[PDB]
Design a protein around this motif. Structure first.
Motif, PDB file in Angstrom:
ATOM      1  N   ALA A 182     -71.546 -37.299  69.433  1.00  0.00           N
ATOM      2  CA  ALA A 182     -71.791 -37.367  70.870  1.00  0.00           C
ATOM      3  C   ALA A 182     -71.329 -38.696  71.451  1.00  0.00           C
ATOM      4  O   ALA A 182     -70.688 -38.729  72.511  1.00  0.00           O
ATOM      5  CB  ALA A 182     -73.274 -37.144  71.157  1.00  0.00           C
ATOM      6  N   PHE A 237     -67.557 -38.729  71.449  1.00  0.00           N
ATOM      7  CA  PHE A 237     -67.017 -37.908  72.525  1.00  0.00           C
ATOM      8  C   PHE A 237     -67.138 -38.606  73.873  1.00  0.00           C
ATOM      9  O   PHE A 237     -66.187 -38.622  74.660  1.00  0.00           O
ATOM     10  CB  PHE A 237     -67.723 -36.554  72.545  1.00  0.00           C
ATOM     11  CG  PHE A 237     -67.176 -35.606  73.564  1.00  0.00           C
ATOM     12  CD1 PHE A 237     -66.085 -34.819  73.268  1.00  0.00           C
ATOM     13  CD2 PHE A 237     -67.759 -35.491  74.811  1.00  0.00           C
ATOM     14  CE1 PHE A 237     -65.572 -33.944  74.203  1.00  0.00           C
ATOM     15  CE2 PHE A 237     -67.251 -34.612  75.748  1.00  0.00           C
ATOM     16  CZ  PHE A 237     -66.159 -33.842  75.440  1.00  0.00           C
ATOM     17  N   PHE A 255     -69.581 -29.490  67.293  1.00  0.00           N
ATOM     18  CA  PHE A 255     -70.630 -29.077  68.222  1.00  0.00           C
ATOM     19  C   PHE A 255     -70.744 -27.560  68.291  1.00  0.00           C
ATOM     20  O   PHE A 255     -71.848 -27.013  68.232  1.00  0.00           O
ATOM     21  CB  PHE A 255     -70.362 -29.639  69.618  1.00  0.00           C
ATOM     22  CG  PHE A 255     -70.631 -31.108  69.746  1.00  0.00           C
ATOM     23  CD1 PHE A 255     -71.452 -31.760  68.844  1.00  0.00           C
ATOM     24  CD2 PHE A 255     -70.077 -31.832  70.786  1.00  0.00           C
ATOM     25  CE1 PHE A 255     -71.703 -33.112  68.970  1.00  0.00           C
ATOM     26  CE2 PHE A 255     -70.324 -33.183  70.920  1.00  0.00           C
ATOM     27  CZ  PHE A 255     -71.138 -33.824  70.011  1.00  0.00           C
TER      28      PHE A 255
HETATM   29  C1  LIG Z   1     -69.021 -38.129  82.814  1.00  0.00           C
HETATM   30  C2  LIG Z   1     -68.756 -36.650  82.559  1.00  0.00           C
HETATM   31  C3  LIG Z   1     -67.585 -36.152  83.400  1.00  0.00           C
HETATM   32  C4  LIG Z   1     -68.515 -36.387  81.078  1.00  0.00           C
HETATM   33  C5  LIG Z   1     -69.423 -35.277  80.564  1.00  0.00           C
HETATM   34  C6  LIG Z   1     -69.275 -35.110  79.057  1.00  0.00           C
HETATM   35  C7  LIG Z   1     -70.318 -34.146  78.504  1.00  0.00           C
HETATM   36  C8  LIG Z   1     -69.801 -32.713  78.530  1.00  0.00           C
HETATM   37  C9  LIG Z   1     -70.736 -34.551  77.097  1.00  0.00           C
HETATM   38  C10 LIG Z   1     -71.641 -35.783  77.101  1.00  0.00           C
HETATM   39  C11 LIG Z   1     -72.801 -35.501  76.143  1.00  0.00           C
HETATM   40  C12 LIG Z   1     -72.396 -34.226  75.417  1.00  0.00           C
HETATM   41  C13 LIG Z   1     -73.502 -33.307  74.935  1.00  0.00           C
HETATM   42  C14 LIG Z   1     -74.523 -34.048  74.079  1.00  0.00           C
HETATM   43  C15 LIG Z   1     -74.914 -33.223  72.874  1.00  0.00           C
HETATM   44  C16 LIG Z   1     -74.924 -31.882  72.913  1.00  0.00           C
HETATM   45  C17 LIG Z   1     -75.947 -31.106  72.120  1.00  0.00           C
HETATM   46  C18 LIG Z   1     -75.236 -30.027  71.313  1.00  0.00           C
HETATM   47  O1  LIG Z   1     -76.208 -29.186  70.680  1.00  0.00           O
HETATM   48  C19 LIG Z   1     -74.365 -29.188  72.240  1.00  0.00           C
HETATM   49  C20 LIG Z   1     -73.287 -30.039  72.903  1.00  0.00           C
HETATM   50  C21 LIG Z   1     -73.906 -31.148  73.743  1.00  0.00           C
HETATM   51  C22 LIG Z   1     -74.604 -30.557  74.963  1.00  0.00           C
HETATM   52  C23 LIG Z   1     -72.849 -32.153  74.178  1.00  0.00           C
HETATM   53  C24 LIG Z   1     -71.726 -31.465  74.966  1.00  0.00           C
HETATM   54  C25 LIG Z   1     -70.741 -32.442  75.611  1.00  0.00           C
HETATM   55  C26 LIG Z   1     -71.535 -33.468  76.396  1.00  0.00           C
HETATM   56  C27 LIG Z   1     -72.425 -32.755  77.407  1.00  0.00           C
END
Ligand SMILES: CC(C)CCC[C@@H](C)[C@H]1CC[C@H]2[C@@H]3CC=C4C[C@@H](O)CC[C@]4(C)[C@H]3CC[C@]12C
Ligand SMILES: CC(C)CCC[C@@H](C)[C@H]1CC[C@H]2[C@@H]3CC=C4C[C@@H](O)CC[C@]4(C)[C@H]3CC[C@]12C
Ligand SMILES: CC(C)CCC[C@@H](C)[C@H]1CC[C@H]2[C@@H]3CC=C4C[C@@H](O)CC[C@]4(C)[C@H]3CC[C@]12C
Ligand SMILES: CC(C)CCC[C@@H](C)[C@H]1CC[C@H]2[C@@H]3CC=C4C[C@@H](O)CC[C@]4(C)[C@H]3CC[C@]12C
Ligand SMILES: CC(C)CCC[C@@H](C)[C@H]1CC[C@H]2[C@@H]3CC=C4C[C@@H](O)CC[C@]4(C)[C@H]3CC[C@]12C
Ligand SMILES: CC(C)CCC[C@@H](C)[C@H]1CC[C@H]2[C@@H]3CC=C4C[C@@H](O)CC[C@]4(C)[C@H]3CC[C@]12C
Ligand SMILES: *c1nc2cc(Cl)c(Cl)cc2nc1NC(C)(C)C
Lengths: 338, 56, 282, 126, 235
Positions: free
Chosen positions: C18, C21, C60
């Protein structure tokens, strides 16, 4: 006989200085106090003309305000279209080190000169469409620092030879040689009537030349380092200079001395290019601090900043209608501002 | 040798001295007068509307 | 407890994934939005960031897809409504995408290493053509062994959503090329470190604490975490290994993002320009 | 006008002492690196001794180190060259020159044949 | 109609950009070298062997890599302005005549021009390959002992040959001092400013030395490699 003639020179210099002080009854900082400031000139990059491979050393606008020429150390003389960011001609040069370039006011020819000590004239409006060398104006024993197209097949070229020159392109031999500068002549600016031009050199002095007669009509001192750029006021009765001193001075051809000093205490970088707006109210100055400052030509206040260049701003240029400001830099990008 | 350089510099100084100079006040007035007269035709001083701005 | 050990691991590795990412999409936006950082090495960096993001989102999914199904089976002793998808190739293909994201991450580490090495060794190359070749390698050579692995699992093997590598010889189809990528990345890493220490010796006091920073910046980029793990159990030792084999590969996305887009000197420079520009506006 | 007139030269016996004062006028003295050059009979311009803007960093040509010393007075805009223990090789016209650009460590072309910001020189005969 | 002329502009732009790509593939492939030197510094011989043995412009090719050497000729001696033209240059090849005499301290004149290249704020990332030329004419000068460098450099008598010395066969201790003392006068400037941006690679050459075309190629690899190794912050 040398010491007595040096004495004559020093007393005549003192006489000229006293005659200038007797003409110095005021300044623009006192007369323009009743002049409202221009506000903040917030100009934004409209187009970024990219495609150059090396530092952009020179740039000059066509009279139509559409076409630019940009000269870069890679050996390219690119003709741009400023409205459609399109390249019209990509002229390869015999010498990669091109230090200057000019766009003929008729639009037909384009010059370039650099370390080859040769000003090459290229014929754009040619019968076959192949942009080819028209002339190679050899004769300077120094690098070509600035060449400006005079109207009737004449070109005023400035060299590191400490000597300017007016060339007749059709024959290829210079008709006049302007001597009197002791340092490398770095920049030129033809008056609007193309009857007088001004020359900046590394002697910290600017000289007003009569292009038809060949005499130094006027020598402007007051700068402290190498004059890197010079530009006329739009009415042809004043000119601005930029030097490594990190200041711009505004000399008047009639007042015979400085009118304004465009400096700032947090500015320590040399000024490579100077231009004027159509009204002559905005003094655009390129710097070594990677950005152009929009000086108030009547108040010496920094009205704005043209920032966004990743390297030294080497060449400025205002369109003949004043609609835009081009700023070439050593980052190989030529940006159009408005 | 340097006699030619000295004679050329002094003749240039006397050629530059015998000129009709003007008070800096009048030149300043003329300069600000041109800046005031051509302020309407300056699209960098006054931002031209985008309707007639070719660089938009 | 084994349960404790496991759950103290997967959530942290997602946390690692996370953080990788988040910091990595920030880093991709930074590398894309400045223009001055636009080079060919930064295009390889953007591709490596995108591939790390692909493996992060892919793990994920893998852990979430399995969980959606698991939740349903255990929701009410259901068992049905879960078996069907495994036989529906709607999970075979998502696992093929998972193995392709993993292979593409390893091969984009390989492409980063190869580009750095030829930049140090063969300095006569056309960055217009060689970049197309590097994109083709990093994104396509993974296909050339993930999709034959897919057709081998489809034709020769049974169900289990292809997560049971029971016939490991068929799993070599995707293992060996990844080990080849890691081995060539290790050879490139030792060469580049030899070049760095040769440049350090030829200079003018203590090269050890600078070679330390150079090597610690080079480990995540070329992806040499794996050379100790992958190349290779005891119940204590196996636990010790999987923990690091997951945590390091989970946080290497964050480490690469930081080391090559945040503490990078040019972007710290790059920021300081755009920011100032935005400032003068105010 | 960058004006660099110099005084204090003249004739001295070998082993004497001289102090050349370089009265700079027309450029803010504290902003730019200064130095001395000399042209011995024989058509050669050689650099003598550098001095930074603040006067902290001072270099010398090998033939004049330990025997020549330069100071600068940024208040009076003057540069000095105290010439101790002079030799008959020190016969030269000494030019007080400043480098071309302020706030630069580089000192270009002070020894050039036709430099612009170089003084008119004072003759020091030993 | 304007659509056809605007699309013709687009097509000319496409041709021009294809030619510019083909020209950039050659531009960033050839290495640009500025060749500097003092008056009769022996650099003329260096031009000849790099020209024939495989301003003025010199193109040679060693190990399939193209090099462009630019001997700045027919220019004045005020290098203040045109030396800014040489930032994209990979290496400024500085030729010093170590034994210019046997006019007036050509070594200190070259040392001060060398000092102004590093401290030039536009050459603060261009590396200098240093050819200390005329190591054979410096031999006969100092071993004879009638003309010293001690009168031009008093710190030479208090200078002992460095431990990094690699004397050629025939280099008596009296010359490897003067050979290496000059090298450290330039390295005193090369280390007191700009670390990590540019690098000095001093070399000892002469009119009889022929592999000078490989010392620049080996050290232009070193310049480019160090330029890449600091883009990744590995160096
Ligand atoms: C600033 C903005 C534009 C960026 C957003 C990025 C998002 C999509 C990132 C940040 C944190 C991430 C989440 C954190 C952890 C999880 C729990 C997992 O069980 C499913 C995916 C999920 C839900 C991730 C999906 C992607 C995520 C939501
Ligand atoms: C650390 C994780 C959470 C990544 C996401 C946060 C990002 C946006 C943070 C982490 C490190 C931060 C950088 C730290 C260093 C500097 C140098 C400073 O002079 C300009 C800002 C700049 C360049 C910061 C920008 C924002 C940054 C990249
Ligand atoms: C756009 C998003 C939603 C999906 C696409 C994936 C994005 C994140 C990644 C995958 C491949 C990447 C591209 C790979 C190559 C190119 C071509 C280059 O000349 C500009 C950058 C660009 C265009 C990259 C932009 C970012 C990119 C498109
Ligand atoms: C589920 C969806 C979002 C998956 C999308 C995957 C996309 C983004 C991937 C798959 C194929 C990839 C492309 C493959 C080829 C090219 C052409 C190259 O010159 C630029 C990168 C680019 C354009 C890649 C960008 C990223 C890409 C488009
Ligand atoms: C457990 C082992 C196999 C992995 C540990 C990491 C090892 C491989 C890392 C850490 C330090 C690195 C070494 C340090 C520097 C040198 C000197 C150089 O001239 C050859 C490469 C070499 C020898 C490096 C090779 C890779 C290296 C040995
Ligand atoms: C936890 C470990 C496995 C991950 C980091 C890799 C380790 C093995 C690397 C990172 C820094 C490296 C050290 C960097 C500094 C030097 C100095 C060099 O002159 C000898 C090798 C030595 C002492 C390296 C040994 C290997 C080293 C300790
Ligand atoms: C500096 N020196 C060393 C020395 C040793 Cl033996 C180890 Cl293990 C680590 C070192 N690190 C540094 N510098 C850092 C990486 C910045 C802490």
């Amino acid at each position: 006989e040398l010491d007595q003639l040096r004495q004559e020179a020093e007393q005549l210099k003192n006489q000229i200085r006293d005659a200038r002080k007797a003409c110095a009854d005021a300044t623009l900082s006192q007369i323009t106090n009743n002049i409202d400031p221009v506000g903040r000139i917030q100009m934004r990059t409209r187009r970024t003309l990219r495609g150059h491979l090396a530092k952009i050393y020179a740039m000059h606008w066509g009279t139509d305000s559409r076409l630019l020429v940009s000269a870069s150390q890679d050996g390219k003389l690119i003709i741009w279209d400023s409205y459609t960011t399109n390249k019209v001609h990509a002229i390869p040069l015999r010498s990669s080190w091109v230090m200057t370039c000019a766009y003929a006011p008729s639009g037909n020819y384009v010059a370039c000169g650099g370390l080859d000590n040769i000003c090459s004239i290229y014929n754009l409006k040619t019968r076959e469409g192949n942009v080819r060398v028209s002339r190679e104006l050899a004769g300077h024993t120094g690098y070509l620092s600035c060449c400006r197209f005079l109207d009737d097949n004449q070109i005023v070229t400035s060299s590191g030879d400490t000597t300017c020159a007016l060339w007749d392109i059709e024959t290829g031999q210079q008709t006049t040689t302007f001597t009197g500068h002791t340092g490398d002549v770095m920049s030129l600016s033809l008056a609007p009537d193309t009857r007088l031009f001004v020359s900046g050199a590394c002697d910290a002095s600017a000289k007003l030349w009569d292009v038809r007669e060949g005499m130094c009509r006027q020598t402007f001192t007051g700068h402290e380092s190498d004059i890197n750029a010079i530009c006329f006021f739009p009415n042809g009765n004043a000119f601005a200079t930029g030097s490594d001193d990190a200041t711009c001075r505004l000399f008047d051809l009639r007042a015979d001395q400085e009118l304004m000093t465009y400096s700032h205490d947090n500015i320590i970088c040399g000024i490579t290019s100077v231009s004027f707006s159509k009204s002559g109210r905005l003094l655009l100055a390129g710097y070594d601090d990677f950005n152009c400052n929009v000086w108030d030509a009547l108040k010496a206040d920094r009205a704005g900043v043209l920032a966004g260049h990743d390297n030294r701003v080497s060449c400025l240029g205002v369109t003949d209608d004043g609609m835009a400001v081009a700023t070439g830099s050593w980052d190989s990008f030529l940006k159009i501002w408005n | 040798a340097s006699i030619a350089q000295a004679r050329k510099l002094v003749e240039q100084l006397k050629m530059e001295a015998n000129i009709d100079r003007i008070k800096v006040s009048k030149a300043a007035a003329d300069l600000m007068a041109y800046c005031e007269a051509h302020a309407k035709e300056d699209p960098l001083l006054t931002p031209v509307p985008a309707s007639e701005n070719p660089f938009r | 407890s084994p349960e404790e050990q496991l759950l103290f691991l997967y959530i942290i590795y997602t946390v690692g994934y996370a953080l990788s990412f988040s910091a990595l999409v920030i880093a991709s936006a930074i590398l894309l939005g400045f223009r001055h950082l636009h080079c060919t090495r930064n295009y390889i960096h953007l591709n490596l960031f995108a591939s790390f993001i692909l493996r992060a989102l892919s793990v994920f999914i893998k852990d979430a897809a399995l969980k959606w199904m698991y939740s349903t089976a255990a929701q009410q002793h259901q068992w049905d409504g879960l078996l069907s998808y495994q036989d529906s190739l709607s999970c075979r293909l998502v696992f093929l995408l998972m193995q392709y994201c993993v292979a593409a991450n390893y091969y984009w580490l390989l492409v980063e290493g190869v580009y750095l090495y030829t930049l140090l060794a063969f300095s006569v190359l056309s960055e217009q053509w060689i970049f197309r070749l590097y994109v083709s390698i990093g994104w396509g050579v993974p296909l050339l062994f993930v999709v034959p692995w897919g057709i081998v699992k489809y034709l020769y093997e049974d169900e289990g959503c292809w997560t049971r590598n029971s016939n490991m010889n068929y799993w070599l189809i995707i293992r060996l090329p990844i080990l080849f990528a890691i081995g060539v990345n290790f050879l490139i890493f030792v060469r580049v470190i030899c070049i760095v220490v040769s440049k350090l010796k030829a200079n003018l006091t203590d090269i050890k604490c600078r070679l330390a920073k150079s090597t610690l910046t080079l480990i995540p980029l070329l992806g040499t975490h794996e050379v100790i793990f992958a190349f290779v159990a005891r119940g204590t030792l196996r636990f010790i290994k999987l923990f690091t084999e997951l945590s390091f590969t989970s946080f290497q996305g964050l480490m690469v993002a930081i080391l090559y887009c945040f503490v990078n000197n040019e972007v710290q420079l790059e920021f300081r320009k755009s920011w100032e520009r935005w400032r003068l506006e105010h | 006008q960058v004006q660099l007139q110099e005084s204090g030269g003249g004739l001295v016996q070998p082993g004497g002492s001289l102090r050349l004062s370089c009265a700079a006028s027309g450029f803010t003295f504290s902003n730019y690196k200064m130095n001395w050059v000399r042209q011995a009979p024989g058509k050669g311009l050689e650099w003598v001794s550098d001095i930074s803007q603040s006067g902290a960093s001072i270099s010398y040509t090998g033939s004049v180190k330990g025997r020549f010393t330069i100071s600068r007075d940024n208040a009076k805009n003057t540069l000095y060259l105290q010439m101790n223990s002079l030799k008959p090789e020190d016969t030269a016209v000494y030019y007080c020159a400043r480098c071309p650009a302020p706030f630069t460590r580089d000192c270009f072309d002070v020894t050039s044949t036709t430099y612009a910001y170089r003084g008119q020189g004072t003759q020091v005969t030993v | 109609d304007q659509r056809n002329e605007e699309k013709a502009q687009r097509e000319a732009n496409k041709k021009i950009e294809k030619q510019l790509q083909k020209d950039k593939q050659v531009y960033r492939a050839t290495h640009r070298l500025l060749l500097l030197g003092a008056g009769e510094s022996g650099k003329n011989t260096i031009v000849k062997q790099m020209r024939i043995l495989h301003i003025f412009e010199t193109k040679f090719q060693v190990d399939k890599v193209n090099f462009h050497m630019f001997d700045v000729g027919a220019q004045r001696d005020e290098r203040r302005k045109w030396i800014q033209c040489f930032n994209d240059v990979t290496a400024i090849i500085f030729v010093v005549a170590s034994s210019s005499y046997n006019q007036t301290n050509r070594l200190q004149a070259a040392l001060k021009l060398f000092d102004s290249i590093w401290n030039n704020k536009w050459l603060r990332d261009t590396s200098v390959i240093l050819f200390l030329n005329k190591q054979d004419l410096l031999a006969e000068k100092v071993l004879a002992g009638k003309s010293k460098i001690e009168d031009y450099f008093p710190e030479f008598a208090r200078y002992t040959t460095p431990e990094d010395a690699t004397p050629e066969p025939g280099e008596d201790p009296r010359v490897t001092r003067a050979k290496y003392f000059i090298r450290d006068e330039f390295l005193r400037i090369s280390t007191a400013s700009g670390d990590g941006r540019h690098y000095c690679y001093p070399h000892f050459t002469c009119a009889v030395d022929t592999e000078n075309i490989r010392r620049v190629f080996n050290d232009c690899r070193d310049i480019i490699q160090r330029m890449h190794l600091r883009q990744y912050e590995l160096l």
